[PDB]
């Protein structure tokens, strides 16, 4: 069905930010994190590998399609998680 | 004696950047109660001042926690964690150990920080119909210069006034108006600046 509206790549590669972009490089997998407050894994001795300063969830709103992304709704989710974490555009070194 | 409480001026702060403003204090403001007795005030250009931080470190409600504060017995430091575009104005080092508070302090010119530009020295001879109207006003216009640390000379001074706008947004510079109000006869008897945008004075006359 992802093939039916022609949103996929015929090779499986997510050519992100590349001239060879064709669509999703659809793959399957998992991933799962154990989370705790910073002053809750330090008194308990639990290893602290990274801290989530802030997070945000923001819908695309009235986009140009259900699957179509919104150009001005991602700016508000990058800034809401930015104004909730107390961090800023010059503090994040790299972006996944 | 009156405690001297002055805050360093010329504070260039750019959006998204952490700054730090300190203060001087001759007589110790750390009172016997263990609490400093100084305040931090911000006069928003075109609006009323605001209470930022009292007792040296305690912040007021309404203003966000970005205004962090601390200090020693004499030395104080308002740790503005970060500046955004609304965070522009005059900060005041008002102490609170000796009423009267008749002097609030010269105030700190907090400015959107940007590299140094070249002041556009524009000499403008007054209109002749003004000269037949009874006055004379030659203006040495300064435009698009930052920081504003220059005064205009009038050679070949004392009749010059000051007129400078605050910073704009998308260009973030200053503009100066040195108006030399003059009289009838003395018109037929030059202006230069010493801004850090240049080094040698630029001499252009009417």
């Amino acid at each position: 069905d992802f093939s039916r509206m022609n949103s996929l790549a015929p090779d499986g590669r997510c050519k992100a930010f590349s001239a060879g972009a064709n669509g999703f490089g659809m793959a399957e997998g998992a991933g799962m994190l154990l989370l705790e407050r910073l002053s809750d894994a330090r008194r308990n001795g639990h290893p602290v590998l990274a801290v989530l300063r802030g997070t945000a969830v923001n819908s695309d709103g009235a986009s140009n399609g259900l699957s179509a992304p919104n150009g001005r709704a991602q700016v508000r989710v990058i800034q809401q998680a930015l104004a909730e974490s107390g961090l800023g555009p010059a503090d994040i070194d790299a972006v996944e | 004696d009156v405690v001297m409480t002055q805050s360093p001026l010329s504070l260039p702060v750019t959006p998204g950047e952490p700054a730090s403003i300190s203060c001087r204090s001759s007589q110790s403001l750390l009172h016997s109660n263990g609490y400093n007795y100084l305040d931090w005030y911000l006069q928003k250009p075109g609006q009323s001042p605001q209470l930022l931080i009292y007792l040296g470190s305690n912040r007021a409600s309404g203003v966000p926690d970005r205004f962090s504060g601390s200090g020693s017995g004499t030395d104080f430091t308002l740790k503005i964690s970060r500046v955004e575009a609304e965070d522009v104005g005059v900060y005041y080092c008002m102490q609170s150990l000796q009423t009267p508070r008749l002097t609030f302090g010269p105030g700190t010119k907090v400015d959107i920080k940007r590299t140094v530009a070249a002041p556009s020295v524009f000499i403008f001879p007054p209109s002749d119909e003004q000269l037949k109207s009874g006055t004379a006003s030659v203006v040495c216009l300064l435009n698009n210069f930052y920081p504003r640390g220059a005064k205009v000379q009038w050679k070949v001074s004392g009749n010059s006034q000051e007129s400078v706008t605050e910073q704009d947004s998308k260009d973030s510079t200053y503009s100066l108006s040195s108006t030399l109000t003059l009289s009838k006869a003395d018109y037929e008897k030059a202006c230069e600046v010493t801004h850090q945008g240049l080094s040698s004075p630029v001499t252009k006359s009417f």
Binding site: R4, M5, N6, N64, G65, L66, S67, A68 | -
Partner: protein, 87 residues
């Protein structure tokens, strides 16, 4: 394609565009589809728009732009553009 046989070359192309619109939107009753409604309120998304432009480029033998659905938001506008693109 109609060979400009009459000024009806206009209404026939309009009806053809409407028929392909009623066959792309899943309208089993191809009788009537809102003409004054845009191509974003009738459910004409990426899939519908793409296969609609393929149908119009196959029946009328034209080369519609990829962003035709956005260029002509209305079926009236699309029909006018297609009928005006004769030569």
């Amino acid at each position: 394609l109609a060979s400009l046989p009459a000024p009806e070359r206009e209404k026939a192309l309009f009806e053809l565009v409407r028929s392909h619109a009623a066959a792309v939107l899943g309208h089993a009753s191809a009788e009537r589809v809102p003409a004054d409604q845009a191509f974003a309120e009738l459910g004409v998304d990426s899939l519908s728009a793409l296969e609609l432009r393929n149908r119009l480029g196959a029946a009328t033998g034209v080369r519609l732009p990829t962003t035709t659905v956005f260029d002509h938001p209305d079926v009236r506008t699309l029909a006018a553009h297609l009928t005006s693109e004769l030569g």
